[PDB]
Every structure is written in structure tokens, then in C-alpha cells.
Design a protein around this ligand. Sequence first.
Ligand SMILES: Nc1ccn([C@@H]2O[C@H](COP(=O)(O)OP(=O)(O)O)[C@@H](O)[C@H]2O)c(=O)n1
Ligand SMILES: [Mg+2]
Length: 131
Amino acid sequence: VKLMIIEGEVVSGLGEGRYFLSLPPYKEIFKKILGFEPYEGTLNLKLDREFDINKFKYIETEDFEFNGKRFFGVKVLPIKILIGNKKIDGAIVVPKKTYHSSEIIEIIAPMKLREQFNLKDGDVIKILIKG
Ligand SMILES: Nc1ccn([C@@H]2O[C@H](COP(=O)(O)OP(=O)(O)O)[C@@H](O)[C@H]2O)c(=O)n1
Ligand SMILES: [Mg+2]
């Protein structure tokens, strides 16, 4: 086991994180796994290379039905979010089935990080992950 520190650049998406994280079943999944109710959104970070989550120990949930529609399970990887000298509880989240790795990762946390830590696009933060 190694603790890895990785840097990423804050970027904007199309608001997808707030869609999913506001849905009751996803809220419940994250609350149970992580022990906090995430702020409804994902802080999207651009890394210098693709992130392969299958290189880490994560929890994976199954697809589920909500109000007549099938939704995808998720892979959940606990992290610490490193902003200055603060270590903030969070997680990396990826859809259960992805067909390649991405240099963009989605981070969840108990608070809105942009608001609490004044992050803007292009700001670089770090994350700590058990590998
Ligand atoms: N824990 C979080 C989650 C999202 N966010 C931000 O909260 C807003 C809504 O999240 P979102 O995932 O729907 O938006 P995008 O990441 O698609 O821009 C965005 O500005 C995210 O960067 C945050 O500051 N802290
Ligand atoms: Mg997002």
C-alpha cells in the first residue's frame, strides 16, 4: 500500500455532477459508503494523464431503477482533497462501466469546494489516494 499524491487542474463541465448527485438513490449510496452527504456536484479535475481507477481499491455499486429508468452503478474511491494545508474528506467517482480511462476525474465532497476554498478554473489542487 502506497499513499499517492496527484495534482489536478479545476475545470468546468456541463453540470452533470449536480444532476446525478441530487438523485435520491445516488445520495443514499454515497452517504452509506462515505459517511457524509455530498454536496450535489462533482469538482472536475484535469490530470496530466489518464486516471485508471482499476489501479486502486474502490467500491462498485450495481445499476438500479429509479422512477422507471435504469441508472448506472458507480465506482467510489475515497480520497483526501489537499488544498493548501487542509486535508478534506472526499471521493473520486466514475461510472461502473467505462470503456477507457480519462484525464478528467470527478471529485465529491461534503461541501462546495469552489465556495469554501475559492477555487476557480485553472487552479491546481492535489488529492491523496491509497494505491
Ligand atoms: N464538492 C464540490 C462539487 C462540485 N463543485 C462545483 O460545484 C458546481 C456544480 O457541480 P457540477 O458537477 O454539476 O458542475 P461541473 O463540474 O459540470 O461544472 C461546479 O462549479 C463544480 O466545480 C464544488 O465546488 N465542490
Ligand atoms: Mg462536476
